[PDB]
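TEACHING EXERCISE
Course module: macromolecular assemblies
Task: Read the component lines below, then compare them to the predicted structure of the full complex.
Student: A.B.
Group: 4
Components provided:
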Amino acid sequence: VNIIKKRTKPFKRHQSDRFKRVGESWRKPRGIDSCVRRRFRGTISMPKIGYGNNKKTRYCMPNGLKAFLVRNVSDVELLLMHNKTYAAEIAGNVSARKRVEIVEKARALGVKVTNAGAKVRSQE
Amino acid sequence: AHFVSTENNEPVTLHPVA
Amino acid sequence: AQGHRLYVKAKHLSFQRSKHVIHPGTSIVKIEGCDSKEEAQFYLGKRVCYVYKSSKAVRGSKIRVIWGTIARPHGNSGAVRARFVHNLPAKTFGSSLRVMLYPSNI
Amino acid sequence: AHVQKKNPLKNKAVLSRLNPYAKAYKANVKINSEKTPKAAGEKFLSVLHEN
Amino acid sequence: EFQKVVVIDAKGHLLGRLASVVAKQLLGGQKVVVVRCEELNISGHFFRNKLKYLAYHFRAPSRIFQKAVRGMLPHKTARGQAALEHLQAVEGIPPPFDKQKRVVVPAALRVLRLKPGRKYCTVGRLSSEVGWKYNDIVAKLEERRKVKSAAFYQAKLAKQKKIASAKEASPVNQKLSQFGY
Amino acid sequence: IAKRAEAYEAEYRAAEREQIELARKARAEGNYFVPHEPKLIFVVRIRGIN
Amino acid sequence: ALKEYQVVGRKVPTEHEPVPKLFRMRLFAPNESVAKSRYWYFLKMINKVKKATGEIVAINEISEPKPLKAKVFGIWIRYDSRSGTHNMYKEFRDTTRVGAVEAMYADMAARHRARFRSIRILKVVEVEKKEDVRRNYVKQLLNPHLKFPLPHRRTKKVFAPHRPSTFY
RNA sequence: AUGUAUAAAAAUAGAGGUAGGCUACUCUCCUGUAUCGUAGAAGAUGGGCGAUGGUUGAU
RNA sequence: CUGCCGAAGUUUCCGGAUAGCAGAAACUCAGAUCAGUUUUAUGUGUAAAAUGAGAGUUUCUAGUGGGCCAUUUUUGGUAAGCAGAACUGGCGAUGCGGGAUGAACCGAACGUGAGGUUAAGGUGCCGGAAUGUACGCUCAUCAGAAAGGUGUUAGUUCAUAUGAACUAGCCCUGGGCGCUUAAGCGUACUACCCAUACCUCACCGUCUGGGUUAGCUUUGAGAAGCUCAGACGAGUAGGCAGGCGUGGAGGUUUGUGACGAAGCCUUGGGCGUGAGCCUGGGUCGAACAGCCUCUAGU
RNA sequence: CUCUGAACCUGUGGUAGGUCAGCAUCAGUUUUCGGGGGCGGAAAAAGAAUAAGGGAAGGUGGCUGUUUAUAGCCCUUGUUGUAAUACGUCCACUGGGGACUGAGGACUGCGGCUUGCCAAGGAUGCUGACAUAAUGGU
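Instructor-supplied answer key:
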């Protein structure tokens, strides 16, 4: 059970490159005569349930860990017993003060922190 | 499966009619 | 400089393709001296390589090699199908591929 | 149960699982070199070598 | 066997068959130089090919042979454009290539492809009355080069005879003749 | 099961031997023997769903 | 890969016809199944016997009794053209009766664009007498003065260095 | 790049060579899988012997 | 945003009520009935064997309620074509390989992938694949892919080795480059090329059939869980289901925030089939969010 | 007295975390060369071998005509034999080459060898290099 994906590239919206009012978020083309919706050659792909990844590998980072979002230092403690499968993602608005409290606690706990070097700076 | 006899019934050659 | 060349020269023809659809995963290679499917059996399994140079000096050298392996013959004229670790660029059509003699079965 | 499909022909161990006879076959048998009685009707040959 | 530079003699060769083998070789990243293109041969008698040109404007067979290949290669594709420059078609045998070996293509040889008694046309003869006006000078160079080449061949033949006599006189030759050498 | 395999192989080999012997005799004395009509065929579909 | 198959067949016996006549003919078919189907079509044309009305009793292939000795074969054939009614008779010199038959089929398929269904083999015979031979070409192949150079010599190893000698 | 190696013409339905005085000869072809080159710590240190030649570089 | 099902495209009476197709529910049965089925046989119909599939009802409710093409069938035609009714399929709701290209032709009907092999069509080059083998025919001085011919090719038949009359093929006259005992045609047999097709496996989902508690140190009871097996996957109108996102509302995270909220840009890194999400850096400066429900100027 | 693998000296004791290539023994799916054999076909047909006869030839010798000669052939038997080859078919006969896959995660089951062991209810070993760049992404 290794982290293997059925596709890397994202699904862009059709004609989203030409226009700027058209967003790159995938929108299903409902055009009645839309040949790109009709799956012609030289067109783009389209999301299907056939593109799902392994259910024992869904949500898994390329190193095998599933990201887990820890707000405060209480959250980093409950990953005590899943440190081999989950990685303590630090929320984006957590201040540099509690950010060190989260990383030092998680280092001793044995869990892996994904963004442990943000807004902080080491000193020897 | 049955033995088809040949006595008094020898095969006769036939050729297509021109 | 007589010597060296423990390999056999070969030319990279194109990709495996229909009339209009190309699959670049596997490429056609025409090895010198190979002119029949029965003869190409000897070269099945060998290690083919593409050798090219570039301006950047990496590890102190200037050579980048894309390894590969012969898999099956391709037609009656001694062509073979070779899969590489990185699919060859479409610009290298009609270039030189060096078919070294290992893994040897003889 | 039956995670994989193993060919009874290709795999000799699965053959023993399915064929409790394959242990003793001896398929090849000498049924010749015993004064072979050449069998051909003379009139059959006559109608064979005609026209 | 393939070389970086290959010289192909066009005398006694079919145009289309010669065009095919060079078209594949050119796509193979190989430089091919064609000499004596005026002596190419096309199946069909002289008048038919004359009518073909009348319906059809480059008078040089070197250009005509290049033109035939040009439509026989992916000219639109930039790969085909690049491969075009690797082909050099010249009339006669120029000095840069006269002192080099000239190989032939079996698949294009007239003697191996044309039934006896079949009429054929020569491009140089065909081109003589369509705009080409250099047959004499081109021919004049041909005898001049072949006369010099024939003298070279005689010297090479004499050298070959001398070394052949020396080779036979060498006792080493028959010492290990069991190898077929 | 092993013994039932013995009987089946013996039945098959005897049937082939009988049929071969049946034709040899007919060829020997000149009469023509027609083999028994088969009861089993294997059908293979060759055309798609269009 | 044609091979001469003998086919013997008869109609299904019944209370009206307890003993059917035996019909045997030699036809050239690439396999047994083609031979049987052709035999039924021939019988329908001549005797009008359906496949269900009858049944085949024996199929057998005939090898050349003397395959190593050259012979001359004459075949009578009826061929279907734009009019749908034509007859021809040709002679060939070959060492195998099948070899003669496949040779004629190629000639028919070339000169007249003849299909296997259209062609029906009428008569097969062996030509032995010198005076029996009629065609000019085989007559030229009969006199003991047969001597001529090999025609169509023309003899991937591309880019041969030397000019081919193409002589003796 | 990896031996980055190779020069007759011409018939091919006869050519070439070989030899004799264009006339009488003969021999080879039927390809290149040929031929040349390819031997050494990339080819060392020296000892020779042997050529006393060969291979080349330098001008 | 994704998932499943998915027509009708029209009878019939008469703008409609029917029907039909598709569903949704309720029923009774597989030891019962069936079939754009095939036989047997009695007189093409009818009745009674095989091959398969579980089959039949009742209720209520969306959409359709056109055609085009092709096949055929005919009738007449009518200059001639053709027209007129039908007949049955295909497209229409359907992509892909081939046909130079081209909606009607030849193949094959679609989850994401790896390998394998093929269909139609092709192997001179463009072009993936034999400038394959065997045999003939084609000479065009417009090839090729009604007739005439001091036009040939093979000839046949009849006259006495020669002619005449004929038999037939082909030529002449009336996709590109090129190809010419073909790279043309025709037959045959080998070998090879490749499709969203066929096989084997992986994976996603759907449906169907299971298994699972005195919860047994296999610990796998979010029983709404875990687990096992098989087949399957086009889609308009339309029906059903699960989700993503915005503003605000009650509960909650003893949540985040001047050690930097929200926002914004950025070829930083990730997550999800996708809607979307999390995060790094730069700006920024005072607010904001995850979860369960409520709600709508979403 | 145990314990804290507790801190240090003492060990220079023993095992060494990801990425990528290499070979091996296996398994599933395959493609491709082989070898050895069984049965069947006119029990191939032939052929050679094989004692004759006859025959004619496109005629050897004799002389176009001619009949084995101073070449012989063909046909017919005879002919060894159960010849061999080929073709067709089978082997629960065997020996190699190459590619793509590793899904599952104690134990069961079904088999074979002889409790143990195994190619039998899906891949494990030996190694290396890179890592302190390779493999990767944009």
